[PDB]
Amino acid sequence: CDEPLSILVRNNKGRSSTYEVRLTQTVAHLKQQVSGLEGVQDDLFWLTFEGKPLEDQLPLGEYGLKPLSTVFMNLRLRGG
Amino acid sequence: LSILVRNNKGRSSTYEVRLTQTVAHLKQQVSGLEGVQDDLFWLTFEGKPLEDQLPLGEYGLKPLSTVFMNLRLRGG
Amino acid sequence: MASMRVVKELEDLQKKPPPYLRNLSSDDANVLVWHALLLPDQPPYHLKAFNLRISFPPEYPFKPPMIKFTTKIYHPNVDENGQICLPIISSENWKPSTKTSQVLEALNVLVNRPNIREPKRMDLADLLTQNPELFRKNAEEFTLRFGVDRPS
Amino acid sequence: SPAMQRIQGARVLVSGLQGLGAEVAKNLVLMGVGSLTLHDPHPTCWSDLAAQFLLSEQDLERSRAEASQELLAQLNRAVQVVVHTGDITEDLLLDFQVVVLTAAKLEEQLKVGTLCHKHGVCFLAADTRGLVGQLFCDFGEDFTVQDPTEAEPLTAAIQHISQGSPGILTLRKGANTHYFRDGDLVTFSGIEGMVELNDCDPRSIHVREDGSLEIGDTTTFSRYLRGGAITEVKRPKTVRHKSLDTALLQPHVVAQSSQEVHHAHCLHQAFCALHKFQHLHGRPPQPWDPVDAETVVGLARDLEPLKRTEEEPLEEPLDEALVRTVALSSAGVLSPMVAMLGAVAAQEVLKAISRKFMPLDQWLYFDALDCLPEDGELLPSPEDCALRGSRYDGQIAVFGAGFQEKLRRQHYLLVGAGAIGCELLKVFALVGLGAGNSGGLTVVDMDHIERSNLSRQFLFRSQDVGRPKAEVAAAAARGLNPDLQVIPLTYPLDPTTEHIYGDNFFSRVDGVAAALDSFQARRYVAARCTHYLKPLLEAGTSGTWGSATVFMPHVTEAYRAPASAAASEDAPYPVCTVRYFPSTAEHTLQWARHEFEELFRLSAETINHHQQAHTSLADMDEPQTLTLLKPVLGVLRVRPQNWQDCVAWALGHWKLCFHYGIKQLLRHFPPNKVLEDGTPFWSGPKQCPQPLEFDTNQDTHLLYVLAAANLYAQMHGLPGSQDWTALRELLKLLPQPDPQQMAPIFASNLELASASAEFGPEQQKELNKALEVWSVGPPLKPLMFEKDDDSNFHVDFVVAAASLRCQNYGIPPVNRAQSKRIVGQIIPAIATTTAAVAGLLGLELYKVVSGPRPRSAFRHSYLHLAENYLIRYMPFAPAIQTFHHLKWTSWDRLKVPAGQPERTLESLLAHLQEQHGLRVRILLHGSALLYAAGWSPEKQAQHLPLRVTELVQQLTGQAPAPGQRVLVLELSCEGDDEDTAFPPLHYEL
Numbered sequence A: 001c002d003e004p005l006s007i008l009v010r011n012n013k014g015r016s017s018t019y020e021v022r023l024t025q026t027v028a029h030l031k032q033q034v035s036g037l038e039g040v041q042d043d044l045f046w047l048t049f050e051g052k053p054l055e056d057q058l059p060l061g062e063y064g065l066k067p068l069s070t071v072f073m074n075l076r077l078r079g080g
Numbered sequence B: 001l002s003i004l005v006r007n008n009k010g011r012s013s014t015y016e017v018r019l020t021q022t023v024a025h026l027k028q029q030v031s032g033l034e035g036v037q038d039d040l041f042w043l044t045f046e047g048k049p050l051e052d053q054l055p056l057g058e059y060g061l062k063p064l065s066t067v068f069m070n071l072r073l074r075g076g
Numbered sequence C: 001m002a003s004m005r006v007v008k009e010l011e012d013l014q015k016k017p018p019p020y021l022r023n024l025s026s027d028d029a030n031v032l033v034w035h036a037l038l039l040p041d042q043p044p045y046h047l048k049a050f051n052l053r054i055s056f057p058p059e060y061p062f063k064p065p066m067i068k069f070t071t072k073i074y075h076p077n078v079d080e081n082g083q084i085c086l087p088i089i090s091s092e093n094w095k096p097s098t099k100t101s102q103v104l105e106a107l108n109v110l111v112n113r114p115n116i117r118e119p120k121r122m123d124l125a126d127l128l129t130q131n132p133e134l135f136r137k138n139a140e141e142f143t144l145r146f147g148v149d150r151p152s
Numbered sequence D: 001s002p003a004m005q006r007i008q009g010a011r012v013l014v015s016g017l018q019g020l021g022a023e024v025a026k027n028l029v030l031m032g033v034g035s036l037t038l039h040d041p042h043p044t045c046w047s048d049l050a051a052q053f054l055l056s057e058q059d060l061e062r063s064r065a066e067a068s069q070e071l072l073a074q075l076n077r078a079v080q081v082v083v084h085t086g087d088i089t090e091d092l093l094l095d096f097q098v099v100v101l102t103a104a105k106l107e108e109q110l111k112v113g114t115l116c117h118k119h120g121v122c123f124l125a126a127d128t129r130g131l132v133g134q135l136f137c138d139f140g141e142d143f144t145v146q147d148p149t150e151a152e153p154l155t156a157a158i159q160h161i162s163q164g165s166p167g168i169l170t171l172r173k174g175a176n177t178h179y180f181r182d183g184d185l186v187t188f189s190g191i192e193g194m195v196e197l198n199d200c201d202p203r204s205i206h207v208r209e210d211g212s213l214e215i216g217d218t219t220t221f222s223r224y225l226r227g228g229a230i231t232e233v234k235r236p237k238t239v240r241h242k243s244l245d246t247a248l249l250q251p252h253v254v255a256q257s258s259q260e261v262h263h264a265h266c267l268h269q270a271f272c273a274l275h276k277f278q279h280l281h282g283r284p285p286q287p288w289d290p291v292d293a294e295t296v297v298g299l300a301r302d303l304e305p306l307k308r309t310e311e312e313p314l315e316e317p318l319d320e321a322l323v324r325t326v327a328l329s330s331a332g333v334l335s336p337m338v339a340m341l342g343a344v345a346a347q348e349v350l351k352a353i354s355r356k357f358m359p360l361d362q363w364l365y366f367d368a369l370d371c372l373p374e375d376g377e378l379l380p381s382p383e384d385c386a387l388r389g390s391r392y393d394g395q396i397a398v399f400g401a402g403f404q405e406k407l408r409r410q411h412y413l414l415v416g417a418g419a420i421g422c423e424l425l426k427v428f429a430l431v432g433l434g435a436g437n438s439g440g441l442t443v444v445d446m447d448h449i450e451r452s453n454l455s456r457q458f459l460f461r462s463q464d465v466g467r468p469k470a471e472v473a474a475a476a477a478r479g480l481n482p483d484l485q486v487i488p489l490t491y492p493l494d495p496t497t498e499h500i501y502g503d504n505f506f507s508r509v510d511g512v513a514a515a516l517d518s519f520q521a522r523r524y525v526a527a528r529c530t531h532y533l534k535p536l537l538e539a540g541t542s543g544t545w546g547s548a549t550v551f552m553p554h555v556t557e558a559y560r561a562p563a564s565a566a567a568s569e570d571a572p573y574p575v576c577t578v579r580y581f582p583s584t585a586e587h588t589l590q591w592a593r594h595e596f597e598e599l600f601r602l603s604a605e606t607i608n609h610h611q612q613a614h615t616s617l618a619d620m621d622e623p624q625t626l627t628l629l630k631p632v633l634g635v636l637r638v639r640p641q642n643w644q645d646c647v648a649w650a651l652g653h654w655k656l657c658f659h660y661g662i663k664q665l666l667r668h669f670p671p672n673k674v675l676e677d678g679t680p681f682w683s684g685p686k687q688c689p690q691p692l693e694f695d696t697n698q699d700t701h702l703l704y705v706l707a708a709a710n711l712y713a714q715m716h717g718l719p720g721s722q723d724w725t726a727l728r729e730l731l732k733l734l735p736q737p738d739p740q741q742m743a744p745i746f747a748s749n750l751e752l753a754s755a756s757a758e759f760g761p762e763q764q765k766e767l768n769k770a771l772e773v774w775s776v777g778p779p780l781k782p783l784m785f786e787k788d789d790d791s792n793f794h795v796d797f798v799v800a801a802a803s804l805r806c807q808n809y810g811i812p813p814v815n816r817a818q819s820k821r822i823v824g825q826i827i828p829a830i831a832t833t834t835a836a837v838a839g840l841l842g843l844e845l846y847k848v849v850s851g852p853r854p855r856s857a858f859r860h861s862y863l864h865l866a867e868n869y870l871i872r873y874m875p876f877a878p879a880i881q882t883f884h885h886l887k888w889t890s891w892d893r894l895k896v897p898a899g900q901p902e903r904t905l906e907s908l909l910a911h912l913q914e915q916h917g918l919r920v921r922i923l924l925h926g927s928a929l930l931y932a933a934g935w936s937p938e939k940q941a942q943h944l945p946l947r948v949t950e951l952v953q954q955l956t957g958q959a960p961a962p963g964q965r966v967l968v969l970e971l972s973c974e975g976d977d978e979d980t981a982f983p984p985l986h987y988e989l
């Protein structure tokens, strides 16, 4: 898998931004990239794909990400 | 009859405060024996607000109770 | 818990104490407060020493430690009560990665080179900018009248 | 605001006011729908009391609509709830805007759906059959939404638009650089200067590399003076929905994956089979009856294959097991599932009414069959599920009487009684959690009910304001279920109250449900539950977001709080970075709040008490406060009695606090003439302060003036009322009162450069005697600041001050969302998402009560109603950490017995090193160090012989009270790192 793919990450405010990640990169790398881009601490949110959350230590290639695949970002909620 | 008092300044134990008199009159003695004004920090008795003109002895202070306080306001 | 990290940091720091810090110790009753002696290496502050207290909030390192100058120090960046405004300590720049050694280094730098941009005492900055010599006189007088016994 | 104007004028129709219809109607009434119309002429039975909270036992053999109308009307007095006892006709459906058919027959669904789609009326058809739901919404052929996303329009700061003809514009570097897109409309709200570009038509933009932003033709307009705020305009989207009789054949289901779509198709087939069975045999299938399940699955087998996607080949058949399981447990209606589906349906109704958010794309199926016993367990029998006239008949028809007894033996805990707490209390009361002589309940909450709370609350009435929240919630819960025993507690679950909620208290509880509003509270409650090994149910909502999680000990991963947010909750933001460098309007409002606190609160306790107690102006920072308080109003050599309704007492403060000071700092420290490091490089970073002209046409500056005047009149008892239409002429009659007091406001009394305390003892004595004179007067009680009173414009004062200061500093003004982001009328909760998370928590409670279940049975839920987003995923396994021989999880702990005689510290260390094979480098109880390997040998020889309890008593100064079962102290080891965390050591006494 020499060719990196471009995926879309959905912000909580309905906005999608194109990223550039490798399937060998762990979810920690993508989480740090989106944390830096969106200005949110990487421990305040978690990102999911196809209805199931993504673990930090596993590589993105385990979850079967296709090019132009939307990965949702879910915040941790405070009010109640 | 004793009341356990702990302060964030350092080591603290039972003070001269007695439940017979309101803490408003005890403000002078606690300020004299602490050296720091009560205006800096607000006392939180077991998660309950406290006021200078509010006698706390009628709110059910069990013997050998506890008192807590935290740093308040901005430093600057 | 913050206390584990604080004890580890203090134990590591005692092995190779910074040259400007000595007799740095914490009471076993509450290991979240540090007492240390600051030794500036730039006149007029080099005549005496300075004692400061480092207080770690319970949620360290996600909240910066609180630093207060227990002794009376004449400085534009230090209020009378002793609180200091370090760039690292401020929440807009604090990061959990920065250990307390960097904070102490920045404090020493700020003591040697004051942050004239944003002082906690405006009149001191005005006096320093308009007449540095009078500031030198007053600072020397204050550090002689209140300076703690400086060791060697 | 415009959306809420349509809701109050809308009219909806709810049919079949069973458990689901009652939930939908309650959510609609709480949200504020202007006029409902309940329609259900059937009498109340026993089978619907397990899910409907408006019908009691005494309401049997009575029409459900009429019985529910009383409680629904008393729920909110602004909603005109009426009951329609006739029959549904075309002229009736013409009037309403939305109709909802909850648990209505397929014939009625098709008839009403065709009639409503013919007349352009939004239609919803929700239905719950046991543990599987169904929602269908059809909003006409041409329905246009106006706010497609739950997000504010984008805002950015512009700095340079000099380049013209392609309309190149530059803006500050950040996320807003890439936030904007190409195919979007952008509207300039309005800035000082460039009247050509203000209030113009929206202009599409083009994003170019290196920050270039193409606006278009702007050279012919005015010259660019100063940058300002730029906002976005949302593009309305038109959505088309197929009619129900057409959408049955091609179900366009909402799902997150292909597997979920196939599951929803199978559920749709099962529901169609159930409807056909009820059409044939005239009765719903019997509870857990094998013959009726076989009949339903046979109907599904011969059901027309065209019900699925005709063009897509039937690669796999429908699940026989899924259809059979749905048929078996389809004879009951449950409170949690009703709550969840009614929340979703009411959200869809609000979407249709207010034309906000993206409407659900036709079908949505919710599967919650995991709450049934595992495949290896004993499923309920038909005789077990036999109805016996109890209020829980609908729940027994799904689970059985033994599960009801298991539910009622439980003794639970509910930390917090807010919105989610009240909804969970309703779910517990209806379900029957501890509604017996062996069980019970506990509600832990400290706060008191206020007006701003009960606006969208369920259990709180108008006359309950000021009473304890826990007590009122307990009374309401006892009212819902008479058998339920609720024990309200006022002491918060806080580390200062670990003596009340100790081992003796936590021994009785069987579980904990947390409905808290902060991350620190959640972290503490999760820590307590982990310490005592109790199941924990945690929920949290924000807007239309929502989560619902269960943390079973040794099963699912322990709670991991976002420590960054927990720390940021209590934020001592430094004033050192807000006095001169306001980055955003948040800094401006923070500074405004800080100055309000400094001037209106701290002055009361220092004007008299501080001077009369001790100290003076020499040994305290008093002179600055006295200088800012004494001459701002005016001495007049007499007692101050002037009314605040005057120009001088407000415009003088406005000019002093916002013009004189900034002018003084500009003339003292010019941005281009700062003497820093000899030669300045970046003096005046990104901001050049400049006071604005006194433009009386702008009414924003008068808002702050009137707010300050009214606040002073309220706090000092000065007369004042709503003279908005009477005092304007007087206010504008004195446009220039500044020169009349030039000398007092110039510099103290006599100063040129102020030298070094040039005022001297002569002025200090005058200041002291002025303070002594002013110290005589009526007492000023230190009344706490109340943000609930919006009528007196408290938050308006802060907002106006922030807006004027940010305009002074060239910062974009505060918007409505920015204002609501802070304690100035913080964002309230929404009834729909609260009910949804409470229903998911009840579904999890079913499994928690059911007993030993694997991790695969439990599910964590996360939903977003504004975009039809919902996920239910099994939680992660415990994170196993390793260190040599020792391996542990987040629940594991070390227990070491102290023995009949208390072991010494050396004995404890030897026992640890032998039993677990680890060498203790640091061992501390709480924040008191007990042993360190780096200690000098004399100190170790001093500490080791002492007993551990004796050592703790010597150090902390307090002996342990009787009942201290365990001393919990943490430890470290040699050769590890700071990443590892050893399990807490429970030193058993």
Ligand SMILES: *OP(=O)(O)OC[C@H]1O[C@@H](n2cnc3c(N)ncnc32)[C@H](O)[C@@H]1O
Pocket (backbone or CB within 6 Å): A079, A080, D415, D416, D417, D418, D419, D420, D421, D444, D445, D446, D447, D469, D491, D492, D493, D494, D515, D516, D517, D518, D521, D829
């Ligand atoms: O509706 P809501 O989201 O505001 O509910 C939160 C409720 O939780 C109470 N609360 C908050 N924190 C605690 C603690 N530590 N202990 C007990 N109750 C607590 C609030 O009263 C609030 O209503």
